């Protein structure tokens, strides 16, 4: 079994908890306390490899310290999540990427950009806009629905594929 330390980052309300809880418990949670940050572990097979996924679902206040720095740099891959009906969450992605790059002290950090809530009609962030920022950073882009589970497995597996590429 290969262990893979994944961190899900992004604004409040984008569905970081819904996405984690779908992969790991296979149900959609309408309300999950927005304050609650936790690690979830799941044994899964990805491309024939048995993996233990250790997923930090981030929450809480914007609050930089040496110990939050340490905690974040143990992530091997980051799922940078925005909601397709939340322009501000999309504009925040650069920030999250910059904090990842800083605590990793590196410009090549395994990462997937995730456009969540693709089930919703009110979309303010176009696929094309997201695709453009992805190709810019050199990372995969995937649209997801924690609600229907569209793209959820693919999102997390794609990240794992990214971690493999990075360590050949
Ligand atoms: C997230 C994150 C994070 C990493 F991804 C990597 C390394 C980090 C090292 C740290 O010491 C701290 C964090 C970290 N933790 C929380 C963080 C946090 N909160 C408030 C909203 C929800 C939450 C789950 O993101 C927790 N929020 C932000 O950015 C929020 C914005 C919006 C308000 C003003 N902020 C700066 C910004 C832009 F766009 F320039 C977005 N960063 C966090 C951060 F870097 C790191
Ligand atoms: N329609 C729809 N609703 C979603 C989807 N994912 C999450 N939601 C909803 O959007 C809200 C936020 O979800 P949640 O997972 O709590 O967001 P979060 O990023 O985890 N916030 P936090 O930082 O507190 O953990 C909830 O009402 C949840 O039901 C999705 O793909 N589609």
UniProtKB/Swiss-Prot annotation:
Effect in UniProt of substituting residue 22 to R: In NS3; impairs GTPase-activating protein stimulated GTP hydrolysis with unaffected intrinsic functions and a virtually functional effector interaction
Keywords: Acetylation, Cardiomyopathy, Cell membrane, Cytoplasm, Deafness, Disease variant, Ectodermal dysplasia, Glycoprotein, GTP-binding, Hydrolase, Intellectual disability, Isopeptide bond, Lipoprotein, Membrane, Methylation, Nucleotide-binding, Palmitate, Prenylation, Proto-oncogene, Ubl conjugation
Gene Ontology CC entries for this record: cytoplasm; cytoplasmic side of plasma membrane; cytosol; endoplasmic reticulum membrane; focal adhesion; Golgi membrane; membrane; mitochondrial outer membrane
Organism: Homo sapiens (Human)
Domain of life: Eukaryota
Linked pathology: Leukemia, acute myelogenous: A subtype of acute leukemia, a cancer of the white blood cells. AML is a malignant disease of bone marrow characterized by maturational arrest of hematopoietic precursors at an early stage of development. Clonal expansion of myeloid blasts occurs in bone marrow, blood, and other tissue. Myelogenous leukemias develop from changes in cells that normally produce neutrophils, basophils, eosinophils and monocytes. Leukemia, juvenile myelomonocytic: An aggressive pediatric myelodysplastic syndrome/myeloproliferative disorder characterized by malignant transformation in the hematopoietic stem cell compartment with proliferation of differentiated progeny. Patients have splenomegaly, enlarged lymph nodes, rashes, and hemorrhages.
Record entry for activity regulation: Alternates between an inactive form bound to GDP and an active form bound to GTP. Activated by a guanine nucleotide-exchange factor (GEF) and inactivated by a GTPase-activating protein (GAP). Interaction with SOS1 promotes exchange of bound GDP to GTP.
Protein name: GTPase KRas
């Amino acid at each position: 079994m290969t262990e893979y330390k994944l961190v899900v980052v992004g604004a409040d309300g984008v569905g970081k908890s819904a996405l984690t809880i779908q992969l790991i418990q296979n149900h959609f949670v309408d309300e999950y306390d927005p304050t609650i940050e936790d690690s979830y572990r799941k044994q899964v097979v990805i491309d024939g490899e048995t993996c233990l996924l250790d997923i930090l679902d981030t929450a809480g206040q914007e609050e930089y310290s040496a110990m939050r720095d340490q905690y974040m740099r143990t992530g091997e891959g980051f799922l940078c999540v925005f909601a397709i009906n939340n322009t501000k969450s999309f504009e925040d992605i650069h920030h999250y990427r910059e904090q990842i790059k800083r605590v990793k002290d590196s410009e090549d950090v395994p990462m997937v950009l995730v456009g969540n809530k693709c089930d919703l009609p009110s979309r303010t962030v176009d696929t094309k806009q997201a695709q453009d920022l992805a190709r810019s950073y050199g990372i995969p882009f995937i649209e997801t629905s924690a609600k229907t589970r569209q793209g959820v497995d693919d999102a997390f597996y794609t990240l794992v594929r990214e971690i493999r590429k990075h360590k050949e």
